[PDB]
Structure formats: C-alpha cells, structure tokens
Swiss-Prot record, chain A:
InterPro entries: Ribosomal_uL18_bac-type, Ribosomal_uL18_bac/euk. It comes from Porphyromonas gingivalis (strain ATCC BAA-308 / W83). Belongs to the universal ribosomal protein uL18 family. NCBIfam families: L18_bact (TIGR00060). This is Large ribosomal subunit protein uL18.
From Swiss-Prot, chain C:
This is Large ribosomal subunit protein uL30. One of its GO terms (cellular component) is cytosolic large ribosomal subunit. PANTHER family: LARGE RIBOSOMAL SUBUNIT PROTEIN UL30M, MITOCHONDRIAL RIBOSOMAL PROTEIN L30. Belongs to the universal ribosomal protein uL30 family. The gene is rpmD. Signal peptide: none annotated.
Curated annotation (Swiss-Prot), chain D:
One of its GO terms (biological process) is translation. PANTHER family: 50S/60S RIBOSOMAL PROTEIN L16, LARGE RIBOSOMAL SUBUNIT PROTEIN UL16M. This is Large ribosomal subunit protein uL16. It comes from Porphyromonas gingivalis (strain ATCC 33277 / DSM 20709 / CIP 103683 / JCM 12257 / NCTC 11834 / 2561). One of its GO terms (cellular component) is cytosolic large ribosomal subunit. GO terms for molecular function: rRNA binding; structural constituent of ribosome; tRNA binding. NCBIfam families: rplP_bact. The gene is rplP. The keyword RNA-binding applies. Keywords: Ribonucleoprotein, Ribosomal protein, RNA-binding, rRNA-binding, tRNA-binding. Belongs to the universal ribosomal protein uL16 family. Part of the 50S ribosomal subunit. Binds 23S rRNA and is also seen to make contacts with the A and possibly P site tRNAs.
From Swiss-Prot, chain F:
The keyword Ribonucleoprotein applies. One of its GO terms (molecular function) is structural constituent of ribosome. InterPro entries: Ribosomal_bL27, Ribosomal_bL27_CS. This is Large ribosomal subunit protein bL27. HAMAP family: Ribosomal_bL27. GO terms for biological process: translation. Residues 1-14 are annotated as: Disordered. It comes from Porphyromonas gingivalis (strain ATCC 33277 / DSM 20709 / CIP 103683 / JCM 12257 / NCTC 11834 / 2561). GO terms for cellular component: cytosolic large ribosomal subunit. SUPFAM superfamilies: Ribosomal L27 protein-like.
Length: 107, 128, 56, 141, 47, 77
RNA sequence: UAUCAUGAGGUAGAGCGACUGAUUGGAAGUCCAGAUAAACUCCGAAUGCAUGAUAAUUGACCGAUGGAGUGAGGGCAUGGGUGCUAAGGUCCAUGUCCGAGAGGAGAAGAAUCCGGACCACCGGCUAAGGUCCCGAAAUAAUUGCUAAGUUGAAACGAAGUCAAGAAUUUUGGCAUGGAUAAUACACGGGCAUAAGCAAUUUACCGAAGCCGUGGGAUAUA
RNA sequence: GACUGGGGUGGUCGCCUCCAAAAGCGUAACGGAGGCUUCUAAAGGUACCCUCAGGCCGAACCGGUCGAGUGU
RNA sequence: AGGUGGUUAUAACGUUGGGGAUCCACCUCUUCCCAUCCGAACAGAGUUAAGCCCAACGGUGCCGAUGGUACUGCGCAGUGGGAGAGUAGGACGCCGCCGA
C-alpha cells in the first residue's frame, strides 16, 4: 500500500457523495509538502470557474482560502460544496476551509 | 517441397452456397496473411493431394483465376465429423519478411528442414 | 405499388397468429383476392403467410 | 469397474443426445482408431470387453487408448415395483456418445492387423463403427 | 430468552414496544425517544 | 420406496418491469432483484430489498460501464 | 397482425491453466496435451417478451350490469421430467384437431393428408390423391433401374445387378440371405414384368372447398 | 381427515432457496437437493480509519507477487 | 514533469534507457494542532536513487475480423437468422478544464 492508492481510495469514497454543478460547484484543495492550491469545478462539462494557489504556513493556507473566496465572489458564486479530496479535515485543510467561510462562499 | 495449386473465385457466401459448392465436389478455401487483403476461392478434392500425404509439402504456389499468384502453407483444415471429408481450407500467405512458423517431420536426427520462404521457426512433428 | 394476394390453401390446422395475419390482410375465404399497396408491413404479412397465398 | 470415485449428486436426469461430435473426432496420440456412427449409452462392461478383445490380439506391442469415460449414473426400478415413488436402485454408470466420436485408438502397430484388432474390439459394442487412420500415415512404416 | 418490554414515563401516556434479550440484558433499558405530548424525554423499561 | 423431496417455495416475480425507452412516473418500480444486479444512477433510488424506483418522471435509461456494471437512470426534461 | 426503433436476458450451442465438481494421460507440486456437467460459466444465438410510432384489418378490446355452463378431457407435433430414450403409459409447457365437425382419399379407423355443411340444381373449376377391370379419369409420351411377383425389422453375410472412381479398393441406386405358431389367406380383390420403382411434361378425373343460377334469413353501414 | 399410477402399510400436509422451467413473468409429478418455526443493546444510526484468504522464501513474526468474510 | 474530469484495459501490468533554477516526491525535527508499541501512516515546523513524468519494446494481460462450422424461426433441408472457440491481426491510449 502506497500513499497514491490510499488517497485514491479516499478520493473515490468522497466523490461517492460530493459533486458540483453550475450553481454549487465543487471545491478541490491540493496540499503538497510545500505550497497549496484550491480549485472550483463544475462537474458536468468539466470546467473550472476559479482557482487560487500559494505560487508557519497556516497563514499562507488562510490567505489562499481568502483569495479563492475573492475569486469566487468576483465570478459570482454564492454557495459551494467542499470535498476533503483525500485529506483528513484537520490542520491546513481546516484552516483553508475556515478562511473560505470567513470570506464569501456560503457553505 | 513445392506444390502447385489452382483455384477459381468464390462469390456467394452462406450455408446454402457452401452446400452447393461441396455438392459440386469442391472445397471452399481462403488465403490470408501479411499486409493488404486476402481472397476466397475454390479448390477441388481431386486437386488436393497435399494434406493426405506423408511429408510436409509446404510452399503451395497458388494460382487463383480472380487475382495473381502467391505462395502459402496449410494453415487450417476443417474435416467432417463423420465422413472425415474436407470442408474448408485456410492458407497463410508467406513472405520473405517475418519468417513463418512450421511443423516439420523428424528422423530417427534429421528433419525435412526449411530455409526458402520460411527462414526459421519450426516446432515439432511426431515426437515419439 | 398495388399487388394482388389470393388465398389458395385452407387455414384449418394453421396457428392462430397465421389466422390473424390472414384476417389482417383481409382474406376470409378460399380463392379470395385482395389488393394492397406493397408497403414493407404488407410484405411482411405476405411473408408470414407465404405458404397459403399466391401473388397474382 | 470404470467410474468416478465421487460425484456431487447421486442422481442425474436422462438428457438428450442431439447431433454429431464436435470434439474428440480427430485422431490425436495415435495412428489408427474407430469412430461411432450412432448415438448411444455405453456401459463399462462393454468398454472392458472391447479393450480385452483388442488387447488379447496385437500381443503386447503398440499402445491402446480408450477416449470415453462413463460418469453418468443410471437407475432401475425393480420387479413388481409400480410407477412413481421416486428413483430406483443404482445400476452403474454409462457414457453418452454421438456419431463421429472416437472410442478406441491404437499406435505403434502394423496396419494390416491393427485393422483386425480394432474390428475385434468393435464387434463387442452396441454401436456401428468406422475404421479411421491418421492423415499423415505412409505405407512404408 | 427474548421478550417484549415497554417504555414509559410519558407526560395520556407515551409507550414504545420493543424486544430485548433478558440474559444479555438483565438490567432495565433506558432510551430517550420522544413524547407526542410535547418533545423528547427519557423512557425506561418495566412498563 | 419413498422420496425425501417434494418441497418448493412461491416464486417472487422478479425482473425488469420498466425497460429502457419507456416513460416512468415518480415512485414507479423499475427493477425487482436480489442484490444490485443493476445499480441506481440519476434520479433513481434503491429500497430495502434492492428495488430500483424512479424519484422523478422521465425516460428509463440502461447504461453499462467498467466491470460491465449496469446502471439505471431517469432522463428528465 | 406486420414493419421499424429502443431495451433486459443466460436457453440451444460452445468452453472449461475463466471458476466448482468429475476425467485422461502425464513427468504431492509444476509443465504439456485429452476431454465432461440439470442443480459449472470467461462466452453466447435463433425465437419469445416489453414500449413507442406507422400500416392493414376487423370489428369485438375494455367498464358496468342480467343469465349461464364448465372445473373426468383426449390424439398428434415439438421442448422436457419419469419409466426401460417401454406402453394406445404418466406429469408439465407451446401449437393444433376431436370433444362440439359433416364432406373427399387412404379397403374398412374420433383426432394422419385435403377441406369448415343457409336451402335447391340431371351446370362448371379445382384440393389431397389418382387415370388396366371391379371404380371416375392416359393400357399417354420420353428416359433409365428391378427379374425378386421384390413391389403395386437389425447386428452380420455373399456381393446378383447397374453406375461412378481411386490406387486390390471405395462409393452410392435396386435387389438377395438373416425373416419365425397355432379356424383360411392376402397388393382391398382380379390381376400386372408394368398396371413395379425413380425422373419430367401435358391433358383428364376428383369434395357439402370455389364459381354459376334460383330462393331465404341475420347483422353492420 | 385427505393425497395416493386400486386400497391398506410407509411417506406427506404451512413457509424459504436452487434445479425440473424450454434466455421476460408464470408453469406439474409419491421428480432431484437442502433449510425454518430465530437472532442482535450491537450484529442498529452516523463521522473517521482499515482490508481478507492463500503459495514460496528466513526464523504467533519481517518483507515481495495473486479463494475470505457477510449470526443461520 | 502539477491538479481535476468524460470515455467498459485498443486505456492495465511489465522491461529498458532519460530527467531537476522550480513543479512533485523522497528528505531532517517532534515543542504546540493531532496521532500510533513505534511521528512507519495520519498531524505540523542533499537528492533524481525511488514514487512520478517521457520515450522505446508486441513481452504478460485486453481487443479481434473474413470464411467455415454448431445451433435455430417458418406446423421442412425449400425459405430466413447465425454463434462460441480458433486463425489473421490491432494495440505501450483518446477528448476536455484550471494552473504555472
Ligand atoms: K390398406
Ligand atoms: K374407370
Ligand atoms: K424438511
Ligand atoms: K461469420
Ligand atoms: Mg424459487
Ligand atoms: Mg448444452
Ligand atoms: Mg421462453
Ligand atoms: Mg374438482
Ligand atoms: Mg381436473
Ligand atoms: Mg394417454
Ligand atoms: Mg409416448
Ligand atoms: Mg362431454
Ligand atoms: Mg373443432
Ligand atoms: Mg373424414
Ligand atoms: Mg377438369
Ligand atoms: Mg361437386
Ligand atoms: Mg360453399
Ligand atoms: Mg382416500
Ligand atoms: Mg424464465
Ligand atoms: Na412441485
Ligand atoms: Na467469433
Ligand atoms: Na475467438
């Protein structure tokens, strides 16, 4: 068992429930050993509507979440849905989600 | 180690056509292999003295009246379950590239051997 | 176009689906002739009752 | 007896032999053989009698193969037993065969008396047979 | 071994019918279920 | 002698009730099955006994995917 | 009912180093090669079924109400179980006929072949099957085979005879031996060397079927 | 009491699963095989996290390649 | 050289060779967030060997004709349907979105 198949299993389980549409789009978050990414996706035509990235680091993650919220408000997205994307909802994931909540992104 | 066979083109297909061809004391045959397309033709039972024969007799130089001439080997023969007559023949066209696979009789330590048309790739025959 | 179908054999001992096909064609008597457009549906009925009819 | 040591079910429905054999109709492993021209059930007693007949001849050279195995159980009712009330007493095993199926085959033997040994075997069977030879065999051994 | 017992302490009355294995649970069950009179309340066994 | 057999149970009338291409209404039963022989898709629910039913009206669609898994969905509007 | 379009199958067949259970050699594993199954499946039809749209066709499909009878079935064909791959046996399924159905051929037969009778006729055409006499219509024409009066049941033997081949040998056509009990026996009979068998062509006979003529009745328009 | 290849003797009588069943549903036999007359305070609900069973190697244990369980 | 999808593996597995200002990954440390006997995983604050990506190989797996044959509808071998296996061969993916 490697981290790739572990995270693929978790991703499949989460995508079992979560899905995004033209309203209420999916909010994927990528975390690496350094930097972080966030992406807002419509899972019908496979079109991403907004994104943010990094380009401690809890502040960096919160700034990334606030930037994603700013992009969502610029593009006109009120409600979203957020998927764990293979990561336990704790640490940087929790901080980014809290920052996106403190911004717009009514979810 | 070189046979000569003649054939005539086949047009109709299906079980009715095959029954008519076999009632005229003939065998449907197909030649395929290499690149490009293949051909479907008619062989005669009397014209065949190849499969009912002790040695390999490969390199069946074929002349079909609907096309040119070729060289091939016995690839598949279909027999009747009861009368044990031939009902269908399939030929593998042989080219100088990608040497063919053959089965060659053994002696005692000697074989028939093959180098022209088929460079290599023998398997066995009557290993006992 | 128009084709003529004539019943030449009896419907006795024929299955009910064939009897109903004869009715749908409009043949109720022996040596009866009906005239129909040669549509694929009509041709299918004629195919179903081919052993009882003649194209005249 | 020639029969399996175990079977999942002790009983079997009498099937229906339908057409010609599409497998086991060509001669592998050997040179001469006999094919059946009819559809029938073949008992182990008949098989053993035929093999004993074919092996009393031919001395002990060559090799003999039987290519059918009896694995279908059959029953019989009995004397004074009326119809109904389930299946009867077991009565052995049979092999169902169709036309074109090779029963017996021989190898390593001259043709002229292989033709006689196989006929001796075929006279102890309830089916009409046909002698077959390999389609590569030559007269000079 | 299995038996039917009732939940009580309503508010008319509120009862819930339910089975329990006595040898597995010698004690008395206590679950907060509901009261159609007002709202949620604890309900205990022994009828 | 006697037979130790002779028992059976009543048949459960399983199978596909609404085939692909038909029109279904909300609550219509589509498939009776033992286990997910077919799986639910869009606007199709599954019950306690793995019964497939339509959440919305529309047209029944049968589709196959990897592992040759069959899915049943309702196409509306 | 037919055509088209869409959909789900796991039967026939097939295959089983694609599983489970059997099986064969093999060279307790393993490798290679046979092969098997109602309660095996990596596969997988033809038909059947469902929905929709057209066409043809009746007309009787559906609701509600008045009146019932039936709830001992049977034969044949197909798919099966059972039995002994027995029974004019028995139990299911799909059709059909007798039941409740007359007429024609098969000598004479409930359901095999042809064919569904409103009544009359001293009219005509056909179906199955026939055209030497009993008995309606060809002792018609042409081409072969049979010599057994065969004609109008098997393993297994000579091969009597014709025909087609291959390198003794195969192959089919027609015959022949195997071929068998008790009131007298059979092509229905006479009888026939064709008036037997196989093929083709044309005329003709042939039913209560169809047409014609006269006369009624019952409904839908 | 009834069923019953006459009756008696024996066996059977309600429910569940497979085959008979002929690729929709349904379909008989004193046809071929088996089970039930319960259980769980978690063996229910939910969030999160894991992956059997087997063969070789080395000595219940470390590592590398393809049936187990689901109370009955 | 990342992420995120639609296409039932013609898309998977394997073998061999090539990769680094930064993209990913390995990589040091457990004080607090959290966590298992074990910071191995989960949780945070010198590298291209390996994961990963690129390419070549028809090897292991997948796909797979034409013809023939089996089977089959029509209450007849006349009129229709038509496999499975196998043999040729095909194949080391294709269509998007965001990012730098
Ligand atoms: K007679
Ligand atoms: K006369
Ligand atoms: K029991
Ligand atoms: K084909
Ligand atoms: Mg059942
Ligand atoms: Mg079968
Ligand atoms: Mg059916
Ligand atoms: Mg009664
Ligand atoms: Mg009755
Ligand atoms: Mg009877
Ligand atoms: Mg019978
Ligand atoms: Mg009566
Ligand atoms: Mg009647
Ligand atoms: Mg009569
Ligand atoms: Mg006349
Ligand atoms: Mg008359
Ligand atoms: Mg009349
Ligand atoms: Mg009684
Ligand atoms: Mg069914
Ligand atoms: Na029953
Ligand atoms: Na195929
Ligand atoms: Na194949």
């Amino acid at each position: 068992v490697t981290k790739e198949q572990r995270r693929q299993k978790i991703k499949a389980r989460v995508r079992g429930k979560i899905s995004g549409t033209q309203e209420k789009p999916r909010l994927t978050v990528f975390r690496s050993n350094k930097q972080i990414y966030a992406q807002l996706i419509d899972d019908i035509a496979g079109r991403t509507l907004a994104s943010a990235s990094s380009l401690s680091k809890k502040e960096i993650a919160a700034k990334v979440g606030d930037e994603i919220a700013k992009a969502a408000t610029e593009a006109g997205i009120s409600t979203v849905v957020f998927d764990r994307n293979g990561y336990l909802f704790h640490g940087r994931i929790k901080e980014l989600a809290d920052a996106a909540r403190k911004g717009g992104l009514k979810f | 180690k070189t046979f000569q066979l003649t054939g005539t083109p086949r047009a109709e297909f299906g079980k009715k056509a095959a029954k008519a061809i076999r009632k005229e004391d003939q065998i449907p045959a197909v030649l395929y292999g290499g690149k490009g397309e293949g051909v479907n033709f008619i062989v005669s039972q009397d014209a065949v003295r190849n499969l009912i024969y002790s040695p390999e007799i490969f390199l069946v130089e074929l002349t079909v009246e609907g096309s040119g001439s070729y060289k091939a080997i016995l690839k598949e023969i279909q027999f009747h379950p009861v009368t044990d007559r031939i009902i269908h023949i399939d030929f593998l066209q042989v080219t100088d590239e990608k040497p063919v696979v053959m089965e060659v009789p053994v002696v005692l330590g000697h074989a028939e051997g093959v180098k022209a048309g088929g460079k290599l790739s023998l398997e066995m025959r009557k290993l006992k | 176009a128009k084709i003529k179908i004539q019943q030449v054999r009896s419907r006795i001992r024929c299955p009910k689906d064939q009897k109903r096909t004869l009715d749908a064609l409009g043949l109720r008597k022996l040596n009866q002739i009906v005239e129909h457009e040669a549509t694929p549906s009509i041709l299918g009925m004629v195919n179903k009752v081919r052993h009882l009819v003649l194209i005249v | 007896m020639l029969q399996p040591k175990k079977t999942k079910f002790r009983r079997q429905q009498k099937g229906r032999m339908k057409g010609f054999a599409q497998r086991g109709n060509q001669l592998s492993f050997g040179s001469f053989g006999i094919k059946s021209l009819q559809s029938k059930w073949i008992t182990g007693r008949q098989i053993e009698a035929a093999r004993i007949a074919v092996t009393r001849y031919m001395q002990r050279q060559g090799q003999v193969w039987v290519r059918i195995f009896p694995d279908k159980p059959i029953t019989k009712k009995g004397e004074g037993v009326r119809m109904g009330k389930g299946k009867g007493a077991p009565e052995g095993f049979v092999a169902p065969i169709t036309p074109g199926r090779i029963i017996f085959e021989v190898e390593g033997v001259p043709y002229e008396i292989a033709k006689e040994a196989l006929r001796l075997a075929a006279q102890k069977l309830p089916v009409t047979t046909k002698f077959v030879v390999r389609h590569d065999y030559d007269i000079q051994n | 071994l299995e038996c039917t017992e009732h939940k009580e302490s309503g508010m008319g009355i509120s009862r819930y019918i339910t089975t329990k294995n006595r040898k597995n649970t010698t004690q008395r069950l206590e679950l907060k279920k509901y009261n159609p009179i007002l709202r949620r309340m604890t309900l205990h066994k022994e009828i | 002698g006697s037979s130790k057999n002779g028992r059976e149970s009543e048949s459960k009338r399983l199978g596909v009730k609404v085939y692909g291409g038909e029109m279904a209404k909300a609550g219509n039963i589509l498939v009776r099955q033992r286990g997910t022989v077919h799986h639910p898709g869009e606007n199709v629910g599954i019950g306690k006994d793995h019964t497939l039913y339509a959440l919305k009206s529309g047209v029944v669609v049968f589709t196959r995917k990897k592992n040759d898994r069959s899915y049943v969905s309702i196409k509306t509007e």
